[PDB]
Write a protein that binds this ligand. Structure first.
Ligand SMILES: CC(=O)N[C@H]1[C@H](O[C@@H]2[C@@H](O)[C@@H](O)O[C@H](CO)[C@@H]2O[C@H]2O[C@H](CO[C@@H]3O[C@@H](C)[C@H](O)[C@@H](O)[C@H]3O)[C@@H](O)[C@H](O)[C@H]2O)O[C@H](CO)[C@@H](O)[C@@H]1O
Ligand SMILES: CC(=O)N[C@H]1[C@H](O[C@@H]2[C@@H](O)[C@@H](O)O[C@H](CO)[C@@H]2O[C@H]2O[C@H](CO[C@@H]3O[C@@H](C)[C@H](O)[C@@H](O)[C@H]3O)[C@@H](O)[C@H](O)[C@H]2O)O[C@H](CO)[C@@H](O)[C@@H]1O
Ligand SMILES: CC(=O)N[C@H]1[C@H](O[C@@H]2[C@@H](O)[C@@H](O)O[C@H](CO)[C@@H]2O[C@H]2O[C@H](CO[C@@H]3O[C@@H](C)[C@H](O)[C@@H](O)[C@H]3O)[C@@H](O)[C@H](O)[C@H]2O)O[C@H](CO)[C@@H](O)[C@@H]1O
Lengths: 598, 598, 598
């Protein structure tokens, strides 16, 4: 039986003819040709005699998956399926160029992985570093070639085995695409680990068009050893994260974990849900990462996300090295709904919607951050969380614009006294920002806008309360150490009638030539005796800076009326003309709106 | 011919050898192994002798599809293809655990359906209830196990046969995922029915990570019998609807159909287009649904949708049962563009962008709704639609914030007089909301903000017109039955010069100690005779509450000038100091901005 | 060997039995049946004897791909794979109905293309027109049938060969879906050409539910011959573009290329990144395109995009033909972050966030554009780019509303003097729009809001600076040729103290009966001699229109004080009552806020 021998051999399929649907005009093929149109791990998961090996906890699938990728790479590419209904364990390190990255599998250009089954790490990796899928082809990323056109997708799962880090200095990753152009991860669930990142895109600005979409990241920090975690790190331009789910349950994640970092221009983070993390996203130009795409991170978008976090939602930064200066500009943060989860005050990093963070070494005088728009977001922190702010402004800021947000937390603008002394320019807080009332009555000894800065210039703060909080010391306070110039600071009178202090300038900074200010105050006045039109003058002489003032109080009297409006005099008194129906010296205490140049 | 017999048998493929692309290092397989990597309905759509059966209107495909799902379930899962180019009819009910749900097909964990062809309901189902795909495994959902990792996707179609409901009490559904974790529907067209829902996600808070993406829902209500319709009902957290299309053509849909309901925390509805529906989305915490995820619906997002509807866009609610109280908070509604379609006034449910709706029994004193941000939306209703409002505020409200919207409809804030008397707290209407002019000249007898409430506290209404409408009775009216306290109510003077009434307080509520108000009014004044500085006093004594007023009128006179600014007196007169170049009693009628504590 | 003959024949696979996974309950099939479940180009890419032909630059694959589409069409449809690891060249025109469209491949209903490999145009097409994939079935689109349920998707590539246009009048396209219902392109990279469009959806309003998602468009203009380019043209309703990437590198693209055009109702452009283009999106109702969906483009959404462009971001338009009038309304532009790329002033079309453009023939008196909301966007242009505006308002406008944007460019509102004279209604510029300072000191001879119109009615401009720019001639200027009525124009005083001109009305238009205005000015006053309450009067008589004015200056004097507030007199003087502690004629120069009816 010669024909029998061929048919039963591995070339058997190549001798059975086939023509699509018996169509006379279709290609006369062999069964093997049609089967060759697809490829799976089963086609490489075999022993040296070619007998298929069943996957399992006792089998290391690494070499077989690598053989599949290497082969498909050699044919110009394709898509390898990792079959559903099986768990495929990885139990050794890869070799060659990915060894320097603690790599397991080496990705190759044009070779996609359709992961329908589960990929699981074996206990070999317990307490060890690892990067599961690596797209670099050299231990030195600077000498690595590119990875192009590599997509990982499916309904499958990458499971990191639950193993803790062995040492804080170790690094662990799921997918490092490397110097990556047109690469993506879609649909995959990454779970059950203690890792540094789940996915990294690009390398120091090298790369383009890399995306993470519709992925889940679940419980990826689990130990006190883990130094730091950011689930997706975007280090190439024209790249981003969309429609993903991020969840952590460990206490440690609330102190160290961030969902996304955006580190190059034209990058985005949109439409995603975050729970249990410390931080939402870093948006930062690191000078050390400026090689591939320049020293500017611009066109940065964080939009339409949903988050419960314990520290800061968006952290802005930029820094310098010996020879390069990083710049961050043209950022939009819009449409996000964010809360600080239930926690004790000071039990996690300081709660904030926006943080202007110092560099990794703690320097606050290196940053060049400007042209940032924060608009149409909602932020909430529970009433007990003292450490919650719309913005913690902890390093030099060259501009940030807030319009039409709803911020319901302890502070609006904050920086800790006796820490950094930021230089602030072009901070714009529009009157359309609504200040919520959750923290009313909690603010004893506190200033709602606590302006603990070296200096403030070209800034606008338009304070509008929407309910009373008589516990606060002031709506806005500038310590004497903070210079203030070419700025507009206003406090709307609504809900302020009973406040002893509204705006406080501890160095009398509101007297500056180009400071435009208005706020309520209580003023004692006394009139002359004259019947008829009669002047009223303030008893105090603290108003040399006031350009006009007007009454916010009713007049309980019949026989006279104080002035509706006032100007000042050289000695610092207010003066206006009221009316004595009957003569007599009058004395009244009136609530006035004090105005300077507005 | 022994070998011939084996090759022609069903085990024939298992005797033909194959090795991928003749690669010496690839697995030596059999053709059957490679074919076994995929699975379709054809592999189960056969008679008892194993002969394939062709689908068609005369064939019930249910048992075969169920057999396929049951089998793949037993192997740890996979994806069953429902082939393109065929219509597969379902013509009987399923059995076992899904019978209590009028179920047709029972879904099982890890078994995906790739629907490329059409699934059609046979006339067996005419006038009957049905739920086409059911993920519960018990008639009692409380005793049901979970459905996990079940995805339905493809370019295919579920067609409900056009059959009307037989009775209003019947229920019909397309996909009920059940107690559903990591389940989704993507790409599918659901059409041609009279159903209650197309898709339901979760059960009373049990479930997670369920999504509906890139689906179409077309003509899914067609009869007067249909009691109610919501196309997608999201009843588990961390779930949502994205990039879907919803269309109805029936008149009945304009009165009963909603596109989406969001009923648990961290849920979303984004980027979708709606036409022909009554309602856009319910966003509600039902106490009766609080078992799986708690009694709070928070982190609720409705964003970037496009809608033509006939009733209300977003309906907020919360309610209670004997032992549980539902709460709704931390909601964002942003970036939506919505219109009321062409219709006669009062011909469908009352038109609204936001509705604060009573509970199912009509109770308006059970709701706990707060921390809602409505920002950056546009709403339009044609000029004839009397029943159109930015917000219909019909039940107790604990807070809602409007910033930077464009509302072009009959009313801004409305509630019907002599219906409910809501208790209102923390209603914030920022001055950045633009009020359109489509309904100018239509408002005879109407108040633009009709404050028909029991009480209003800690609220802000900053009215800014952008064109004249002298037909309206007032910009804002508070009936004497509505208490008003700790609130700010302002009417900007632009386009108001000719209005007889701007703000109306029928119980003189603007006199409250912590009410901050400003609005224009016309006032008659008379001066004393004195040459020189001379007082002017109002003829009326209705101004005991005014803290200051200033002129909005020019002075046509040469020989005198009235005061630019006024205060009040104990008897309720305004008083200010003007100037008589020549003596004489003066009498003038002036438009003033009346101010209280602002 | 009779059995051998059958097995080796093209019917061989139809004689080898198969039963899925040896399941006794599965269908007893033949291998051919299972292989027949899929279909690829390999099944048709053969010679007349049925021998497979290898693709390559020397092989025209067109006829084979067409045969595949024609065949699958005949079976009710399916998905044809274009295999990965191969480049498939097209080298001739198609025949029949697509010839009138210079068509290569004719698409057919229900036949999807899964493009995993590359499709490349051969040099046959150099200097020639072409439309690669055409869904029309007639040379005359008006006589064409529909294309339904056609999806093109995959990780593959359409490469236009780099060939330049041969003549400016030629047209080139990638995918013309035609009269297209439920058609889409997903994941595909279109690159390396000189084309008119990459994708067109619909035809003159005929079509529905067509989408372009997750596609890349790279370097699709390369010559001075190319007349015009818009990458995706949306010409059917309920359709749009989402999550796409658009990049150009040619200088010509900066002058002629637009990323998207939206031309019918309920269409969108979202979540996309654009670099190197002239324009972002046209949003236009062309009367010539009103056949299929009506003469109104409404529910138009441009949201959450990222762009670097050289001309205009969003261009609005509508026009008329002999018998049809186009209307554009109900548009939202929100959440976009856009910059003008580095370029010399006037070196590309005039930079703008919004352009109200004239029609194709240059007519500016045909447009009906209204109910547009522009909110929560950021725009930046470098300081040297004189030709940069938030809005270039160059044709009649019936309404546009700006709320809560950040605009950092040369002009806010602009139209060139001595060009068109638009009639403007319902232009609303809310005070929540933040005006950036990049162009401070660059504005010599320029007006920030340059109101070069025939007339302005029912409009609001609330100017708020956030830093000083004393170079500008004025904040807002109306030439005498521009009528102004029923409008509100205000200039906030912050950063204006040193400006000689704030608001300028060259025809004294601010005196209109229903003009509501406020702005700062410097005024010289002189008092009478009288000790005590004493009048101050302006020296100039230019204030007959002023209803009130108040001091923006401090009083450096001890012996007297000028009035805090003023009204006017019939002769055009201001007058107020100040106070002389000691008698004497006083003379002062004061900065006042002039107010009319506000
Ligand atoms: C400036 C820089 O090194 N950037 C890295 C980036 O590094 C981050 C750093 O920005 C900071 O965020 O903290 C974390 C700590 O978790 C990172 O630092 C750690 O990792 C870097 C990167 O690691 C090296 O380079 C990789 C490409 C190799 O695969 C890896 O084996 C290792 O050689 C390391 O230099 C630090 O010492 C370590 O603390 O990380 C991103 C994402 O991986 C990378 O793109 C960028 O170059
Ligand atoms: C409190 C509650 O029952 N919630 C149901 C939800 O029910 C809605 C209800 O919220 C209201 O919206 O009106 C509609 C009417 O169209 C619904 O009520 C109708 O359906 C419910 C649910 O049906 C039962 O439970 C299902 C899980 C079974 O499959 C079904 O066979 C039936 O036993 C019913 O109790 C009402 O009497 C009926 O009027 O509906 C959602 C979505 O299905 C569900 O998740 C939730 O538990
Ligand atoms: C009114 C109109 O013709 N609309 C066309 C649309 O045409 C655009 C036009 O709106 C303008 O934008 O400039 C460009 C120039 O690049 C277009 O005009 C050019 O193309 C049109 C359309 O071409 C004809 O009709 C197609 C359906 C055929 O496939 C083609 O072979 C040709 O017969 C042409 O009439 C102009 O003369 C030419 O300058 O284009 C869109 C998208 O294709 C189309 O849907 C709409 O009908």
């Amino acid at each position: 039986d010669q024909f029998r021998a061929i048919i039963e051999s591995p070339e058997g399929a190549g001798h059975v003819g086939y023509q699509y649907r018996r169509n006379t005009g279709s290609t006369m093929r062999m069964v093997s040709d049609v089967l060759d149109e697809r490829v799976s791990l089963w086609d490489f998961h075999c022993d040296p005699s070619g007998n298929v090996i069943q996957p399992g906890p006792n089998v290391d699938s690494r070499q077989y998956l690598q053989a599949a990728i290497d082969y498909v790479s050699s044919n110009g590419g394709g898509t390898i399926t990792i079959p559903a209904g099986y768990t495929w364990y990885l139990g050794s390190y890869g070799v060659g160029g990915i060894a320097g990255h603690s790599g397991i599998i080496q990705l190759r250009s044009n070779v996609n992985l359709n992961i329908e089954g589960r990929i699981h790490l074996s206990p070999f990796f317990d307490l060890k570093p690892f990067q599961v899928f690596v797209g670099f082809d050299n231990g030195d990323p600077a000498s690595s070639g590119n990875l192009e056109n590599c997509h990982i997708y499916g309904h499958g799962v990458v499971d990191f085995g639950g193993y803790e880090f062995g040492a804080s200095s170790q690094l662990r990753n799921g997918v490092a695409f490397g110097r990556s152009y047109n690469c993506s991860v879609t649909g995959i669930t990454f779970q059950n680990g203690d890792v540094t990142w789940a996915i990294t895109l690009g390398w120091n600005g090298y790369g383009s068009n890399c995306y993470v979409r519709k992925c889940r990241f679940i419980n990826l920090v689990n130990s006190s050893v883990n130094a730091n975690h950011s689930t997706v790190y975007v280090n190439c331009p024209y790249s981003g994260v969309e429609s993903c789910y991020f969840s952590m349950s460990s206490s440690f994640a609330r102190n160290i974990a961030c969902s996304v970092e955006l580190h190059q221009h034209d990058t985005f983070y949109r439409g995603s849900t975050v729970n249990g993390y410390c931080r939402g996203a870093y948006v930062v130009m690191h000078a050390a990462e400026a090689a591939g795409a320049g020293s500017y991170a611009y066109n940065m978008q964080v939009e339409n996300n949903i988050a419960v976090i314990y520290g800061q939602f968006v952290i802005l930064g930029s820094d310098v090295t010996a020879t390069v200066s990083g710049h961050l500009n043209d950022v939009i943060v819009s449409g996000n709904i964010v809360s600080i989860g239930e926690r004790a005050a000071f039990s996690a990093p300081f709660g904030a919607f926006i943080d202007i963070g110092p560099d990794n070494s703690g320097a606050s005088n290196v940053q060049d951050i400007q042209r940032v728009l924060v608009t149409g977001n909602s932020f909430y922190a529970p009433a007990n969380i003292t450490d919650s702010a719309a913005i913690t402004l902890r390093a030099n800021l060259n501009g940030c614009t807030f319009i039409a947000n709803n911020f319901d937390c302890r502070y609006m603008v904050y920086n800790a006294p006796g820490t950094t002394s930021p230089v602030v320019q072009n901070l714009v807080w529009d009157k359309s920002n609504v200040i919520g009332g959750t923290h009313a009555n909690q603010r004893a000894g506190q200033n709602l806008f606590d302006m603990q800065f070296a200096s403030v210039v070209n800034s606008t703060i338009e304070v509008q309360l929407s309910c009373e909080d008589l516990s606060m010391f002031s709506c806005i306070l500038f310590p004497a150490s903070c210079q203030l110039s070419y700025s507009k600071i206003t406090v709307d009178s609504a809900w302020t009638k009973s406040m002893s202090n509204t705006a406080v300038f501890e160095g009398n900074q509101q007297a500056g030539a180009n400071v435009y200010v208005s706020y309520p105050a209580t003023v004692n006045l006394t009139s002359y005796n004259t019947q008829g039109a009669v002047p009223f003058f303030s008893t105090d002489t603290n108003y040399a800076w006031v350009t006009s003032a007007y009454s916010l109080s009713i007049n309980e009297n019949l026989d006279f009326s104080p002035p509706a409006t006032y100007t000042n005099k050289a000695n610092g008194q207010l003066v206006g003309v009221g009316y004595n129906e009957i003569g007599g010296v009058r004395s009244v205490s009136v609530r006035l709106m004090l105005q300077r140049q507005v």
